[PDB]
Amino acid sequence: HQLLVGERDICEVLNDDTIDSRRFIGINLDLYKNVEELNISEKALERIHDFQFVRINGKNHALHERLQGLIYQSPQIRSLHWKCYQNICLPSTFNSEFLVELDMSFSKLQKLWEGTKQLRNLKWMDLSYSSYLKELPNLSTATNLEELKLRNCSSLVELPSSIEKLTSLQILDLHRCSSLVELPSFGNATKLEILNLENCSSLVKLPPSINANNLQELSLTNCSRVVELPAIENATNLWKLNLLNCSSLIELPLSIGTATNLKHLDFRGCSSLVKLPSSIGDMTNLEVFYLSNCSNLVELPSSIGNLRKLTLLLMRGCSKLETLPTNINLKSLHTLNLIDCSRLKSFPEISTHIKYLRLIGTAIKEVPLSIMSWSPLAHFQISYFESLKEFPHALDIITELQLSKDIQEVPPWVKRMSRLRALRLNNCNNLVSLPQLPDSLAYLYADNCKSLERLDCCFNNPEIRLYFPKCFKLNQEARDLIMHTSTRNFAMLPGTQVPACFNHRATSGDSLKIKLKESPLPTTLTFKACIMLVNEEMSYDLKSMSVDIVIRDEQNDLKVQCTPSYHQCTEIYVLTEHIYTFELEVEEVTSTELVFEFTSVNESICKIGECGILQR
Amino acid sequence: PSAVEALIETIDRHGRVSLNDEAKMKKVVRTWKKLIERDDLIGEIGKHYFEAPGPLHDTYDEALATRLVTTYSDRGVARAILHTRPSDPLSKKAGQAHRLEEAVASLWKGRGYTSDNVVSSIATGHDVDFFAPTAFTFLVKCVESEDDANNAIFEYFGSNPSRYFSAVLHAMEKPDADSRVLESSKKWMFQCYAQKQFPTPVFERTLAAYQSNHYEKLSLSQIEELVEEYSRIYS
């Protein structure tokens, strides 16, 4: 209808003792302005004029005593929307026979009704954010109900036993009912369409089974005490099923594989999940399948081969995992992410078109001779073990190595390793020197090597990132090589002041004055910048850093262009007493002095302090 | 071209163009809204950016979040998250928005951000905005506990209970403010002054001393609300 939009400017109409009070089907109020009582004559409280569409927008800590007098005396209240109700219970004079919608999206209710009332034609009931609600009414005789959205009702201890009789329910949003401890059995014909139980930190029991012919979503994203899961009968058209962080889940319903249209399954955090059901392979179009931190998952079923569409198989921290299925060829597998699976003890050979193979922390210790039959691997990462020399077929395919803490010396045969693009040392507390590395190298993350004083290489990859965090022991010829290696990316080093080789130093700030070495006979000029960070609270794990660069001339005013114009690295560490270097490229500048302003994106994480540069 | 190709080329151009801070704060919201228009975009672009050369990630959402944060800064992403909240939580748009927001939260956790870094990234300039639900829920998502989020907001105010109480009282006026959470924050402040064995009635004069960027200087020292309540809740 055309709503009577009024804000305290309809309350004067109702004071009139004429019949003008009657014949108001719809009322729409907005009570943002605070007042305890509307200025209404006591004679208008006697008049029994009815409303059918009531839309009131309440105010916090403003219990309108008179407004409740006129509203709930209306016999045929078809609709009701009272945000911020601000009363303990609905008045006892309420007649809800013709109620079709109910909506109290913020409230201080504690129990709606005293007894079993008639709800013959109620079709919607939104009671969201009613943090003080204690119990729902007797929802029997509410057959035509469709939705029941109890979102974020913290204090709701238990759902009514009469939920079984809501034979028309479609949506049941119980999002963050942190105190609900049991979901009652629903019935044989309800056919919920959206069963949302996202953050029920104290939910324990669930229905033994629910009809699921028309079911699309079923979310339990932090239910930490759900012991088992109701059987999903048909699930012909599930769209979403996520059980993130659902610990204490011991098994899975054997009918979970009936969901033949599901395309993404997420079980991250599902600790104490012993084994997947044998019907998993029944799923079709299952493209993405996350498992992470799934301890006690001791085996992975061999029915996977039926999937034929799996693309991503993430498996991190699966400590107890022992044996992957054998003699399968996943046709469309793309990445096998098996990191920190301590007890793998056997190479993963479950496909032939894998492109990203991540095997770090696994106690694998062999490589099969069958890999030359595989498709080329764009990323094959395995943590180094001593008995790797016996596999010449594994050296030319490998891409990333990872030396462990207890490595006495990097083997000299690393130079033979052809397609190597990274070498990460993780707190190599007993090391001395690094040998010559293959020229395909593009990353060198010496994380916290206590003693790595010697570098005996000459890197010649134009895009190499020589990060040496917290690696203090280093002879000056090593520190010279790290700084003076020509690379278009960053370079880390432990230091306390910007070195002397960067002549044109400047104080802590974003204003560098440099002078051109000569009349610019070469058109282009090359600059090597150095940067420290302002000492400020630094998290032990700060791992993101980006830099902006702007060059402007002061002798003649013009914003000279810069070719790199930014350096970004999402793997570099952010540490206080460390030196960051990079490269700069410029045009042919008609001037003779330039100003460099090395700002930094994300000024809330790290700011650039001392920074001096040089010209090559 | 199609929607996916157009949005990918837009993101790439924005990333490499080195645009102004206000320009990025304006374009991030447009791109962000384009992302959640249909439910087949986040997955497809996440899959495209997963396979592209670069660092290796664990999920598609992490790849998309990494590219978005790299293109538009940490503050731009938070701006887009706070100002693009759909109405119905059970819609498709709200589902896509929650996917993006959770991906960004996990991105920030994976880089070892503290509570202060997250708060300074969310920080808009008005002290009342930290208690709006669309920002408080994201902050709790990033710090995993309401106590830590409240402590972070308290420390961002220079450990000043006057400014904190002024902000909470202003957040009480908000129309869609989850009053349970606001009383949770107020109760947390009362508690942290309570178990400290600081049950002095001087809480009134401590507030008066701590009161006079800038903020509304509560003159309403709530001699009962912010005093008698502390008086009879504990000791």
From Swiss-Prot, chain B:
Its main location: secreted. It is found in: Secreted; Host cytoplasm. One of its GO terms (biological process) is effector-mediated perturbation of host process by symbiont. Monomer. Interacts with defense protein RPP1 from several ecotypes including RPP1-NdA, RPP1-WsB, RPP1-EstA and RPP1-ZdrA, via their leucine-rich repeats (LLRs). Keywords: Host cytoplasm, Repeat, Secreted, Signal, Virulence. The keyword Secreted applies. The ATR1 effector protein of Hyaloperonospora arabidopsidis is a polymorphic member of the RXLR class of secreted effectors. The ATR1 alleles are differentially recognized by RPP1 genes from different Arabidopsis ecotypes (Niederzenz, Wassilewskija, Estland and Zdarec). The gene is ATR1. The chain holds residues 67 to 310 of 311 of the full protein. Secreted effector that acts as an elicitor of hypersensitive response (HR) specifically on plants carrying both defense protein RPP1 from several ecotypes including RPP1-NdA, RPP1-WsB, RPP1-EstA and RPP1-ZdrA. The RxLR-dEER motif acts to carry the protein into the host cell cytoplasm through binding to cell surface phosphatidylinositol-3-phosphate (PIP). However ATR1 does not bind to PIPs, even though it harbors the RxLR-dEER motif at the N-terminus, suggesting that the RxLR-dEER motif is insufficient for PIP binding. The tandem repeated WY domains are involved in the recognition of the RPP1 defense proteins of the different Arabidopsis thaliana ecotypes. Belongs to the RxLR effector family. Residues 61-143 are annotated as: WY domain 1. Residues 144-235 are annotated as: WY domain 2. It comes from the Eukaryota. This is Avirulence protein ATR1. One of its GO terms (cellular component) is host cell cytoplasm.
